[model samples]
Target: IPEPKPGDLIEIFRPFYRHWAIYVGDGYVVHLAPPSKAIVKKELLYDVAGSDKYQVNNKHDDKYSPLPCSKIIQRAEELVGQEVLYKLTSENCEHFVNELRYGVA
Candidate 1:
């Protein structure tokens, strides 16, 4: 009942910290991970959630300007398979999806 449009920022509950992903449409979400390529990866929303609850949290939309839906989706699409480093100080799943949603992360 609470489906998000493509490009919406999603927050998933996980241990220690929350997880972040950007919805890219058709039940698919792109997220950063540590498994396999240790890069951004795409998978079904449910698969990514793994029975854990999640919500669409455009938390900063009230203050920060967000990119257009098309642009955000396209940006996520381009980076789905690219490998990246986890600069935890600034960049992580949180920063990745947050940056994709708004110009700032």
Candidate 2:
């Protein structure tokens, strides 16, 4: 995939689960990681996803009328340093991005 632009959603395809993050441009991605990792920023796509089987785009973007790119990016940035309980069903990486993009979790 080409380099992701700001506000773009990136996903990694793991066998058991998928990981999601928001591309904040300039080669940085913001994501809600495991509690041990917390919400952290990573510099490379591979590092963020931790696998080569990853896709970058606005996955499931048609599901909602999203906020403006700037607003979405802002919301993603604001979540940095926050901590999540990291529940697979209730709250996970996908949930994190969806909440910012769609204003609903």
Cα lDDT computed for each candidate against the true fold: 0.81, 0.70
Each candidate's TM vs. the true structure?
Answer: 0.87, 0.77
Assess candidate 1 and give its TM-score to the true structure: 0.87
- Each candidate structure's count of clashing pairs: 0, 0
13-90: candidate 1 lDDT, tens digit per residue: 776667888899999999887764367888999898887888998888898888998989888888877987554322
Candidate 2 residue-wise lDDT, 40-67, digit = tens: 5445665766654876757566676777
Model 1 weakest lDDT span, ten residues long = 84-93
User: How well does candidate 2 score on lDDT at residue 36?
Assistant: 42
Candidate no. 2 TM-score: 0.77
Instruction: Give per-residue lDDT, candidate 2, residue 10.
Output: 76
In model 1, the runs with Cα more than 4 Å from the true position are: 87-91
lDDT score, candidate 2: 0.70
Q: Tell me the deviation in Å of residue 89 in model 1.
A: 8.9
